[PDB]
Design a protein around this ligand. Structure first.
Ligand SMILES: *[C@@H]1O[C@H](CO)[C@@H](O[C@@H]2O[C@H](CO)[C@@H](O[C@@H]3O[C@H](CO)[C@@H](O)[C@H](O[C@H]4O[C@H](CO)[C@@H](O)[C@H](O)[C@@H]4O)[C@@H]3O)[C@H](O)[C@H]2NC(C)=O)[C@H](O)[C@H]1NC(C)=O
Ligand SMILES: *[C@@H]1O[C@H](CO)[C@@H](O[C@@H]2O[C@H](CO)[C@@H](O[C@@H]3O[C@H](CO[C@H]4O[C@H](CO)[C@@H](O)[C@H](O)[C@@H]4O)[C@@H](O)[C@H](O)[C@@H]3O)[C@H](O)[C@H]2NC(C)=O)[C@H](O)[C@H]1NC(C)=O
Ligand SMILES: *[C@@H]1O[C@H](CO)[C@@H](O[C@@H]2O[C@H](CO)[C@@H](O[C@@H]3O[C@H](CO)[C@@H](O)[C@H](O)[C@@H]3O)[C@H](O)[C@H]2NC(C)=O)[C@H](O)[C@H]1NC(C)=O
Ligand SMILES: *[C@@H]1O[C@H](CO)[C@@H](O[C@@H]2O[C@H](CO)[C@@H](O[C@@H]3O[C@H](CO)[C@@H](O)[C@H](O)[C@@H]3O)[C@H](O)[C@H]2NC(C)=O)[C@H](O)[C@H]1NC(C)=O
Ligand SMILES: *[C@@H]1O[C@H](CO)[C@@H](O[C@@H]2O[C@H](CO)[C@@H](O)[C@H](O)[C@H]2NC(C)=O)[C@H](O)[C@H]1NC(C)=O
Ligand SMILES: *[C@@H]1O[C@H](CO)[C@@H](O[C@@H]2O[C@H](CO)[C@@H](O)[C@H](O)[C@H]2NC(C)=O)[C@H](O)[C@H]1NC(C)=O
Ligand SMILES: *[C@@H]1O[C@H](CO)[C@@H](O)[C@H](O)[C@H]1NC(C)=O
Ligand SMILES: *[C@@H]1O[C@H](CO)[C@@H](O)[C@H](O)[C@H]1NC(C)=O
Ligand SMILES: *[C@@H]1O[C@H](CO)[C@@H](O)[C@H](O)[C@H]1NC(C)=O
Ligand SMILES: *[C@@H]1O[C@H](CO)[C@@H](O)[C@H](O)[C@H]1NC(C)=O
Ligand SMILES: *[C@@H]1O[C@H](CO)[C@@H](O)[C@H](O)[C@H]1NC(C)=O
Lengths: 321, 317, 317
């Protein structure tokens, strides 16, 4: 009478199906999920500095639309723009809006430094009932609407050197009156011109008189432009009418700052990865929540699930049942 | 006296070469090709709706060049532009031609809806011998060349709101006369201007008087522009000369439509994948026919062959 | 009396650590490095034709800034621009500088063919003290500053057909005077205009009078533009002032040419792969030296080391 010694391995009652080279479905004892497919629905307020735009786009906060005044000098890692945002100042357009929004978002700051521009022979601080600031007419806080003084608008020719060791961003504009009467009444000259230049570059804009769609009482518009002045360079502004002047410059920075469109609420929690759907955990290497992300995030993939086997092949005893 | 039992495997006299981790060439009993390297030379007319441009580019069909009038309100999944296509109307350019072509191709339709623009104090329906319709002069069917009425061209100022639930594409233009005499003769004012705007954006174009190369009798030109008006927005057009006015809008869609340059003939057959060389089968995961494709297609790779082994190592006798 | 026969494998006293699927560090008898992480610090002058820009950008050599005259008709596989480069001619800007630089770099040649343009009723060969050529005033060698003759500047209207079988690149410009007095003094007319066109395209530029920052004595500027004329097409130039005329065309080519910013010295040696840090060997499949490369190069990766095992597991003792 001898003895029997059998070698074997475990099995479990409920295995999981995984994919391999040779099988699209085969059963193993256990597996783990590699795709993050859910979010909290909330943007965590740490560890990144989140700035909720509320009723304001970044551009409106930049220009200084009065209901956006609370954003003066703000900073962010991620500026969050809401679908409820609205403009409530002079109607405007920005040629290459997308680029201005991008470069400001990336700079991470609206830090503004006022400069002593000398505008000889014109009236400063023009305002409109389309841009109410308290009970009276007003204007974008960072811009200076220049108009005639007495019976003249002389050729403006002013300079501002950059003697600092950082880049200066200047935001300026051009006023497009609705009629010839408006043009001559504001600027004397029948056709204006704005030329803004540095040593190496220049932009010249001719205003265009005529009607655009009525917005807050006005068929006129302002067009917004920008100019970056590097250390050792100089800004020159030259105009015989229709200039919407800068009051100063924004300080440019580089770093980790960006902007996101989302309606998710901001909550008190901690998450490295942010999507427009809300924050997601980053323990998994892949995610199917949103291709738009900010921070340390899993890579976006199209699959909603991918199972990595964490055990052997599951081979139950055949039952006659 | 015992017995011998030998274990073995098959072989064939002529195997096939495959690549592995350790070998560039190793012989196995069988393999299958993973790169589609051939085409029929023909574009199959199913299952995608193919519209052959013949003598017309998509942009000429859009503007309404007279030899392209047969394309009015046509639709497609894939518009096919031929190298023989030509223009035969007023000479024009489109700044950002590529974008206009792309967005129209993608919309998949030339469906045009006329709108009642009121152009007070100007003559409508200008024509040219460069763009013949029948025995007379003519013009692009979707555009309205405005000129002076009597001795004046007043400031034109019109509006058109978008109260529908779809995007409206408006095509319009600016006329660049060859001389000052032409400018004043057509528009009275010595310098024109066209401003087309919505609530949030605007384009302003100043025409430029002078000669360009002679095309069908003319050194003048038209420049073509577009404006998309979304639901709830409004179009305003403002001009004191040189406006080539829209007659209406094109109804925009989104979906699977595109455009391809090809000279391959269209045939009656079925193929999911189309290239400029013709349709290709899509049973293989890769293809080396053309990086330009439309439909359910193998991915383009640089290799002209890649063999997947479907059998063991071949060790012949 | 029997015998013992033991089967075994080698080991080495100091192995190397490698990564696998299951281990981030495991010891094998030998490995080899797959990431090139160092450079000579020098650009090898073979087998690619290297052209050192020295004090000149490609654009300054193109326009013909006098200290760049030595580059006339030069050719290259790789043009090397140095951080010490400076301009020393009329102050200028190029809208879409990056595109002009790219297309010229890619063409690989500054081969220039002078053409007999007829500029009726104007003075040719204008110069400035901002662009000295020898002791006296001068200008970009490939451009022709036109000004009034006597008391008039007539409308210029000239043509040049492309009857060759290659593409022609024309470089031209527009002068922006500092004051109204400068404008009328040079061109008579109070406002100029430059229109340069082919059959299919056109550019029209309005000059802008006013001050820019002082550079070499001047608050005026020149703006530089380009036009490519294909075989069978025609160039037309039309202007009533402010034109900086082409003297001819550059011959366009296609091929392997490019441009790189680098301060590495050029040396007599052989290397297929060039980076701004200098040439690197290309025996390894990957490199972490610089994402900017030219030639037959390893692919840029973020890792500074990756070890491929070239032996078994090392089990010492
Ligand atoms: C160029 O053409 C356009 C289109 O014809 C034209 O724009 C239109 O002008 C009128 C008059 O200014 C605008 O009417 C306003 O519309 C809003 C509704 O959105 C109303 O709130 C306004 O009502 C107040 O203002 C009136 C005074 O004008 C009062 O009578 C009234 O009691 C209210 O206080 C008013 O109806 C209309 O919106 C625009 N339309 C567009 C699309 O812009 C423009 O004026 C023309 N230009 C010239 C120079 O003629
Ligand atoms: C500005 O200068 C331009 C250059 O001189 C002037 O344009 C020229 O104007 C003349 C006469 O008005 C045109 O001549 C006609 O052109 C065609 C030729 O077209 C082409 O086709 C034929 C084949 O049919 C071919 O042989 C030619 O090579 C052309 O390619 C003829 O059919 C007519 O009989 C006649 O010759 C010139 O073509 C035209 N040239 C260009 C490049 O535009 C322009 O008039 C001047 N502007 C002003 C205001 O004076
Ligand atoms: C078989 O695989 C599954 C994963 O697919 C294993 O279940 C997971 O087990 C881990 C811990 O081993 C759980 O994580 C823990 O979560 C709690 C809070 O829920 C946290 O406080 C702990 O610090 C820890 O992170 C995880 O939730 C769980 N996940 C799921 C989806 O079940 C399971 O343990 C494996 N079985 C065997 C026998 O190994
Ligand atoms: C518009 O305003 C600007 C700034 O006030 C004027 O530009 C300035 O013009 C002066 C010449 O009057 C330049 O000075 C020169 O500097 C060099 C050395 O840098 C010196 O060697 C010369 O002797 C000369 O004094 C000054 O640099 C320049 N400023 C800038 C920023 O470029 C411009 O002339 C005004 N124009 C009109 C028409 O009002
Ligand atoms: C995260 O948000 C995205 C964006 O809203 C969701 O995906 C979209 O949902 C629409 C239907 O409303 C689908 O047809 C599209 O596939 C998605 N749109 C876009 C523009 O990508 C997504 O479901 C959300 N995911 C989670 C987990 O909440
Ligand atoms: C090759 O040159 C590049 C470009 O200057 C060097 O990269 C810089 O060096 C360190 C990190 O390596 C940083 O402080 C700089 O910001 C880097 N600049 C850029 C533009 O990447 C690189 O180190 C050099 N490599 C070798 C091997 O010499
Ligand atoms: C913004 O910051 C600058 C300097 O850092 C300061 O002078 C300025 O007054 C600040 N503005 C506001 C609104 O706090
Ligand atoms: C080789 O493999 C293919 C694909 O599996 C198969 O269709 C073919 O019949 C096989 N040929 C032979 C000779 O076994
Ligand atoms: C397809 O057309 C392209 C582009 O004309 C050509 O280079 C390629 O060789 C063609 N290939 C086949 C398989 O017909
Ligand atoms: C490792 O690799 C090469 C041979 O491929 C040789 O020069 C070197 O001596 C080897 N080193 C060791 C420790 O085996
Ligand atoms: C430039 O190109 C050719 C030389 O092949 C010739 O027409 C011309 O004289 C050359 N000029 C110079 C300066 O070398």
């Amino acid at each position: 009478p001898g003895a029997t010694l059998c070698l074997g391995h475990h099995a479990v009652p409920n295995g999981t199906l995984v994919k391999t080279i040779t099988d699209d479905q085969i059963e193993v004892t256990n597996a783990t999920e590699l795709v993050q497919s859910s979010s909290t629905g909330k943007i965590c307020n740490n560890p990144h500095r989140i700035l909720d735009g509320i009723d304001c786009t970044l551009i409106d906060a930049l220009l200084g639309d009065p209901h956006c005044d609370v954003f003066q000098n703000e900073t962010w890692d991620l500026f969050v723009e809401r679908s409820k945002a609205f403009s409530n100042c002079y109607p405007y357009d920005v040629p290459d809006y997308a680029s201005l929004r991008s470069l400001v978002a990336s700079s991470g700051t609206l830090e503004f430094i006022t400069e002593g521009f000398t505008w000889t022979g014109v009236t400063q601080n023009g305002g409109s009932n389309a841009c109410k600031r308290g009970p009276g007419s007003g204007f974008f806080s960072r811009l200076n609407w220049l108009t005639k003084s007495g019976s003249t608008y002389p050729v403006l020719n002013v300079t501002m050197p950059n003697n600092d060791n950082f880049d200066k961003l200047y935001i300026w504009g051009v006023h497009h009156p609705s009629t010839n009467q408006d043009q001559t009444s504001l600027y004397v000259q029948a056709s204006g011109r704005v030329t803004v230049s540095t040593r190496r570059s220049q932009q010249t804009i001719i205003p265009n008189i005529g009607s655009r769609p009525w917005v807050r009482g006005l068929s006129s518009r302002i067009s917004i432009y920008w100019t970056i002045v590097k250390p050792g360079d100089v800004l020159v502004i030259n105009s015989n009418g229709n200039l919407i002047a800068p009051r100063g410059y924004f300080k440019m920075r580089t770093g980790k700052s960006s902007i996101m469109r989302s309606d998710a609420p901001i909550d008190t929690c901690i998450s490295e990865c942010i999507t427009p759907n809300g924050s997601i955990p980053n323990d998994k290497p892949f995610q199917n929540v949103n291709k738009i992300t900010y921070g340390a995030c899993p890579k976006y993939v199209k699959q909603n699930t991918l199972k990595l086997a964490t055990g052997m092949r599951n081979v139950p005893e055949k039952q006659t049942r």
